[PDB]
């Protein structure tokens, strides 16, 4: 019954990404900093859709990182809203209405799909925007994640319609591999994730999505209203992380895992100590 609520463990989900492991660790540590709640991390959820079902079936009590553009198209099956503020507002409204899920305001960073080349390619062919690559598309191999080609929504098929180009070859692979694939010249162009730490490190160039094909992908935690009711301290704790972690910061945190070979929990703890757990 209710008087046992404070002895329940808060299960925090992470997708198969370094960024999601870092944020799920950081939120679990902040919750334990403030309360006597135990927390655990449920790792390796494969996708937006898996995080969704784990929230609805009790497998996780908090999804640490969900992305507006992904959930708009993929969960809600709505037309992709292009304005950041409108997309967030629509997502929060529909998540509450449809699922009784609370989609919080963003941590402060967006992690968008970004068409990405070597700085050498971009400098040789004067490539700044996605529209600049149109005339070259047939002679480029595009590396993509193991998930993006199968999206009916803001996927490849609609991309080719809006930009009127088709790549010579498309090669789906684990996201973590696209950075070295483009750096080594195995791929000519990759659909990277914009908060990856290796983009800067590896000397890569993101091309502007001048036609605004992509929705925003602002990142937030998502929690069932039932969990917030039963643990009324959680909302005030979650709020402490919101709007505090910008894209540059998330890139540096990702680099600590993928480039400096640190455990996501260690990266999360050192960030919390550097910033005094968000209140000094």
Ligand X SMILES: C[SH](C)CCC(=O)O
Residues interacting with ligand X, by CB under 6 A?
47-48, 67, 70, 111-113, 193, 217
Asked if 194 and 112 touch (Cβ cutoff 8 Å), the reply is: yes
Between strands 204-206 and 113-118, the pairing is antiparallel
| Nearest residue to ligand X, scored by beta-carbon proximity | 70
Cα–Cα distance, 105 to 91 (Å, whole number): 10
Q: Which is nearer to ligand X, 90 or 228 (CB)?
A: 90
| Helix, strand, or coil (residue 219) | strand
- Is 227 within 8 Å of 77 (Cβ atoms)? no
Sequence-distant (6+) residues with CB within 8 A of 221 are 23, 27, 62, 63, 64, 65, 66, 104, 107, 238, 241
Q: Which is nearer to ligand X, 41 or 48 (CB)?
A: 48
Residue 55 C-beta: closest distance to ligand X, Å = 14
Q: In terms of CB distance, is 41 or 52 closer to ligand X? A: 52
Write b or e for each residue in 164-173: b if 16 or more Cβ atoms lie within 10 A of its Cβ, otherwise e. ebebeebbbe
Six token digits for residue 140: 């480029």
The least CB distance from residue 2 to ligand X, in Å, is 35
Q: Closer to ligand X at the Cβ: 31 or 101?
A: 101
Pairing of strands 9-15, 62-67: parallel
Q: How far is the CB of 231 from ligand X (least distance, A)?
A: 26
Q: How far is the CB of 145 from ligand X (least distance, A)?
A: 7
Which residue lies nearer to ligand X by CB, 47 or 201?
47
* Least gap, CB of 193 to ligand X (angstroms): 4
In the complex, the smallest distance separating the C-beta of residue 126 from ligand X, rounded to whole angstroms, is: 26
- Taking the least distance from each CB to ligand X, the nearer of 67 and 179 is 67
Q: E strand or H helix at 199, and its extent?
A: helix 198-201
Q: Are 45 and 13 in contact (CB under 8 A)?
A: yes
């Amino acid at each position: 019954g209710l008087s046992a609520a404070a002895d329940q463990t808060i299960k925090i989900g992470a997708q198969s990404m370094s960024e999601s492991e870092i944020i799920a660790s950081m939120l679990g540590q902040l919750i334990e900093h403030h309360t006597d709640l135990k927390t655990t991390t449920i790792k390796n959820l494969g996708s937006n859709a898996v995080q969704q079902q784990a929230l609805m079936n009790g497998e996780i009590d908090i999804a640490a990182t969900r992305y507006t553009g992904t959930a708009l198209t993929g969960t809600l099956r709505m037309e992709p809203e292009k304005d950041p503020d409108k997309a967030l507002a629509l997502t929060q409204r529909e998540f509450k209405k449809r699922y009784d899920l609370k989609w919080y305001d963003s941590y402060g960073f967006d992690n968008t799909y970004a068409f990405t080349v070597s700085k050498e390619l971009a400098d040789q062919y004067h490539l700044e925007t996605v529209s600049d690559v149109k005339k070259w598309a047939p002679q480029l191999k595009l590396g993509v994640d193991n998930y993006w080609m199968k999206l009916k929504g803001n996927g490849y098929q609609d991309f080719t319609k809006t930009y009127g180009m088709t790549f010579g070859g498309t090669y789906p692979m684990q996201i973590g591999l696209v950075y070295d694939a483009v750096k080594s010249g195995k791929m000519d162009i990759v659909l990277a994730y914009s908060t990856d730490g290796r983009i800067k490190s590896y000397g890569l160039k993101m091309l502007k999505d001048d036609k605004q094909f992509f929705p925003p992908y602002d990142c937030s935690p998502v929690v069932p209203e039932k969990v917030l009711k039963e643990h009324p301290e959680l909302e005030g704790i979650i709020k402490k992380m919101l709007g505090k972690i910008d894209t540059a910061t998330m890139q540096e945190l990702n680099y600590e895992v993928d480039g400096n070979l640190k455990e996501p929990s260690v990266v999360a703890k050192e960030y919390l100590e550097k910033h005094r757990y968000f209140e000094s």
